[PDB]
C-alpha cells in the first residue's frame, strides 16, 4: 500500500547509526493529489488515479506542454485541483481510506519500511552485444579478426533459420524496472522529500513510482 510519486535528484552518503555509512538516494515527492477513484463496477478494477505535479492552466498559442488543454482541465476540476504533469494509477492500496482531492503526503511513510521503486532506465543508445549483454569477447592479437562482434547466430542446415531470442545488438534503453525491498532513512516534511537506501533507476529529475513491498 501507500503509493506515492516523485522524481530523482541525486545521491549522497549518510552516517546512520553506529557511525554506519549508507549511500542514499533523494526523492522530491510533492503536491501528489488524487484525481479519480476507480471501481470494479464502474471500471472493472478497484484502483485510484493520482497526479504528481501541477502545471500551468489553459491558455492560447500553447505550443509546449507546461500549459494544459481543455479536457485536462476538466479532469483537474472534477476534483478541486490544478493541471498536473505526470499521472498514474495504483491498485495495491485500499481506496476506502483515500478520498478524492487529498494530498497524499510524504509523511505517509516512515524511516525503515519495505518498498518497491519503479522507474525507468537512463537509456544509452544503439549498442553492441557485449554491452547489451554479458558476452565476453574475443581475441585482440595472435592474428585475429573477431574482436567485439558475435559469431554464431544459430544451428546448421538442420532448422535452417534463426530462432528468436537471440541477443543481437540493438538499443540499450530506458525501460521499466521494479527493484524491491529497499528501505527508508528519514521522512522530511519541509522540503517533503525522502531518502532511500541505495540507487534507483533513471536519470536525475525523472520520475519514480514508489510504493510498498510486501516481502
Amino acid at each position: 500500500t501507500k503509493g506515492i510519486l516523485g522524481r530523482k535528484i541525486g545521491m549522497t552518503q549518510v552516517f546512520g547509526e553506529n557511525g554506519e555509512l549508507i549511500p542514499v538516494t533523494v526523492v522530491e515527492a510533492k503536491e501528489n493529489v488524487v484525481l479519480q477513484k476507480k471501481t470494479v463496477e464502474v471500471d472493472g478494477y478497484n484502483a485510484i488515479q493520482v497526479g504528481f505535479e501541477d502545471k500551468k492552466a489553459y491558455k492560447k498559442d500553447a505550443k509546449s506542454n507546461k500549459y494544459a488543454n481543455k479536457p485536462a482541465e476538466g479532469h483537474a476540476k472534477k476534483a478541486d485541483a490544478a493541471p498536473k504533469r505526470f499521472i498514474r494509477e495504483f491498485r495495491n492500496v485500499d481506496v476506502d481510506a483515500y478520498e478524492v482531492g487529498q494530498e497524499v503526503s510524504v509523511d505517509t511513510f516512515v524511516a525503515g519500511d519495505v518498498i518497491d521503486v519503479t522507474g525507468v532506465s537512463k537509456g544509452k543508445g544503439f549498442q553492441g552485444a557485449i554491452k547489451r549483454h554479458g558476452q565476453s569477447r574475443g581475441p585482440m592479437s595472435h592474428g585475429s579478426h573477431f574482436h567485439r562482434a558475435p559469431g554464431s547466430v544459430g544451428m546448421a542446415s538442420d532448422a535452417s533459420r534463426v530462432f528468436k531470442g537471440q541477443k543481437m545488438p540493438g538499443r540499450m534503453g530506458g525501460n521499466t524496472v521494479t527493484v524491491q525491498n529497499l528501505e527508508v532513512v528519514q521522512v522530511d516534511t519541509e522540503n517533503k522529500v525522502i531518502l532511500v537506501k541505495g540507487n534507483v533507476p533513471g536519470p536525475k529529475k525523472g520520475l519514480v513510482e514508489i510504493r510498498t513491498s510486501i516481502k
Binding site: Q13, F15, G19, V26
Partner: protein, 114 residues
C-alpha cells in the same frame, strides 16, 4: 528549490568542531574503535595526502610508515567515529595530492614544516 535541497538536508549530519588544514601537514587522529567489549579509542598519526569535494563527500587521506611499510588510511570528515583531531604540524607543499610519495622511503620522504 532544485539546487540547495541536498545541502539543506545533509547539514543535519555534518560536523563543525573540526579544524582546517591542507596537504603538507602532520596530524594526530583519535578514533573510536568499538571492539566487541568496549568503545576503546586509539590514535593514528599521519600525513595529509588529499581531500576532495565538499559536503559529506569531503573526505581525506593520511600516510604512515609502520615497519618500513607504507600504510594509508582514508576517512570521511564528518563521520562520528572520530573523537578528536590535532594539527601536529604543517608543511610547504606545492600540489594538492601527494601520490608521488608512495614510492619513497626515508629522507627522500622528508617534509619542510610550514
Amino acid at each position: 528549490t532544485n539546487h540547495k535541497l541536498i545541502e539543506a538536508v545533509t547539514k543535519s549530519q555534518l560536523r563543525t568542531d573540526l579544524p582546517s588544514f591542507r596537504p603538507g601537514d602532520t596530524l594526530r587522529v583519535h578514533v573510536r574503535i568499538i571492539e566487541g567489549t568496549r568503545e576503546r579509542i586509539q590514535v593514528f598519526e599521519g600525513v595529509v595526502i588529499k581531500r576532495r569535494g565538499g559536503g559529506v563527500s569531503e573526505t581525506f587521506t593520511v600516510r604512515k610508515i609502520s615497519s618500513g611499510v607504507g600504510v594509508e588510511r582514508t576517512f570521511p570528515l564528518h563521520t562520528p567515529k572520530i573523537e578528536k583531531i590535532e594539527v601536529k604540524r604543517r608543511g610547504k607543499v606545492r600540489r594538492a595530492k601527494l601520490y608521488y610519495l608512495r614510492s619513497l622511503r626515508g629522507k627522500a620522504a622528508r617534509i619542510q614544516e610550514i
